[PDB]
Each structure stands twice: as structure tokens, then as C-alpha cells.
Amino acid sequence: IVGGYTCGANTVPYQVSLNSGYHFCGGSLINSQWVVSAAHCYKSGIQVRLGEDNINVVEGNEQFISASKSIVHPSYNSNTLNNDIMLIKLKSAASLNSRVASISLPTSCASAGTQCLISGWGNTKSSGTSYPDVLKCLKAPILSDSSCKSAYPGQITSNMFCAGYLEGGKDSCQGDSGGPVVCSGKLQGIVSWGSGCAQKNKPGVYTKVCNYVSWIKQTIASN
Numbered sequence: 001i002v003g004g005y006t007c008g009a010n011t012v013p014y015q016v017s018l019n020s021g022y023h024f025c026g027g028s029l030i031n032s033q034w035v036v037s038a039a040h041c042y043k044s045g046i047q048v049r050l051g052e053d054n055i056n057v058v059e060g061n062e063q064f065i066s067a068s069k070s071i072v073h074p075s076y077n078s079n080t081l082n083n084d085i086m087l088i089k090l091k092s093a094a095s096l097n098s099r100v101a102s103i104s105l106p107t108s109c110a111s112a113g114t115q116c117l118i119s120g121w122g123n124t125k126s127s128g129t130s131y132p133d134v135l136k137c138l139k140a141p142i143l144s145d146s147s148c149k150s151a152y153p154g155q156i157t158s159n160m161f162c163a164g165y166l167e168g169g170k171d172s173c174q175g176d177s178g179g180p181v182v183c184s185g186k187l188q189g190i191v192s193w194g195s196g197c198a199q200k201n202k203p204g205v206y207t208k209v210c211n212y213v214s215w216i217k218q219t220i221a222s223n
């Protein structure tokens with residue numbers, strides 16, 4: 001997250017870190033057994049780390065649970081990033097509590113102008129590189145479809161929205177991918193892509209979660 005703020009330990013209780021020897025992506029806990037992330041974060045050998053604040057120090061609220069199964073969306077295209085969503089099932093159920101909690105799925109799509117919270121352990125610089133230990137947060141609005149398309153001609157599908165600041169300075173970045181965009185207590189986005197971070201006229205692009213609720217529910221119901 002570039003241009004954000006320190007969230008505070010365990011104030012984003014649905015935020016998980018995906019670890020394969022090291023943090024590599026975010027995700028969002030949606031029930032005691034299942035995490036939402038980005039399909040471009042797929043790999044084998046994932047350990048899900050819940051209850052994290054400083055991802056390099058054991059602080060006492062973590063739960064580490066290995067994935068039993070990953071399911072990439074049926075229509076994911078890794079060239080266009082269309083349908084950039086996957087589900088990850090945990091080998092055992094997380095203990096839910098005030099610091100490890102699931103986030104509700106949307107019941108309708110959010111509109112441009114809605115305020116949201118984006119969070120993650122990604123890079124905090126727009127030139128160069130610095131990775132934080134503790135979780136970073138950014139409040140950002142959803143941008144209109146039309147400004148998102150004009151920002152990225154030929155690349156925004158109906159399964160994507162933009163959020164952030166056309167002026168630049170405040171955005172998600174590398175290592176945030178797969179993490180949450182939560183608006184009014186609902187998971188409306190997943191950190192997906194952009195062109196650099198925090199550049200003028202290049203806001204972040206996010207997977208539009210409301211399009212996937214019936215796939216998420218039916219997948220959980222049978223897996």
C-alpha cells in the first residue's frame with residue numbers, strides 16, 4: 001500500500017497473508033474454512049496465516065493453517081486478468097474470534113463514490129521498494145466505470161472496477177494482490193492489477209466480487 005496508514009494490530013480481522021516460505025499475497029477469510037484471493041496468486045504449498053499484524057514476528061494472535069485445495073475461477077484468463085479470483089480451503093477450520101473473523105459477501109454491487117478500505121503487506125513506495133512488516137491500510141473511493149476505462153483503454157471488463165485517486169500518491173501495490181477491498185462491511189473487491197503503483201491516471205484495478213457470489217456459494221456448498 002502506497003500513501004496509506006498503519007492499520008493497527010488485528011483491526012482488519014478478515015485479512016490473511018498467504019505464505020509459501022514468505023508472504024506473497026493477501027486474501028480475505030469468508031468463513032471458518034475458506035479464503036477469497038486473486039487467481040494470479042495461485043500456487044501449490046500455501047499456508048494461510050490468520051491473525052497477523054507483523055508478518056515477521058510471532059505476536060500471539062496468529063493461526064497458521066495449510067490449504068487443502070485451491071480452486072481458480074473457471075474462466076480466469078491470466079493474460080487479460082479477467083475473472084481474477086480463486087478460493088482456498090483450509091485443512092482445518094479457523095478459530096473465529098474478535099481478531100480472526102470472516103467478512104460478509106456483498107448482496108449487491110457497490111457504486112462509484114462508495115468509500116472502501118484496502119489493506120495489505122505490499123510495497124509502500126511508488127519508485128523503488130520498501131516492504132512493511134505491519135499491515136497497511138488505505139481508504140479509497142470506487143471510481144466510475146467511465147474513468148476506469150479511460151484510464152486503461154481496451155482493458156477494463158465487466159468483472160473489474162477501479163478504486164483510488166486519479167491524482168496518484170495513494171494505491172495498492174506489489175504484494176497486496178489478492179487482498180480485500182471492503183466497503184460498508186462487505187467484500188466488494190480483490191486487489192488485482194494496475195500499471196505501477198500510485199501513478200497519475202493509473203488507479204488500482206480490482207476484481208468485482210459481487211459478480212462471483214453465486215459461484216462462491218455453490219463452490220463452498222460442494223467442496
Ligand SMILES: NCc1csc(-c2cccs2)n1
Pocket residue numbers: 171172173174175176177191192193194195196197198203204205
Ligand atoms: N497499483 C495497483 C496494483 C495492485 S497489484 C500491483 C502490482 C503488481 C506487481 C507490480 S505492481 N499493482
Ligand SMILES: [Ca+2]
Pocket residue numbers: 052053054055056057058059062
Ligand atoms: Ca506475526
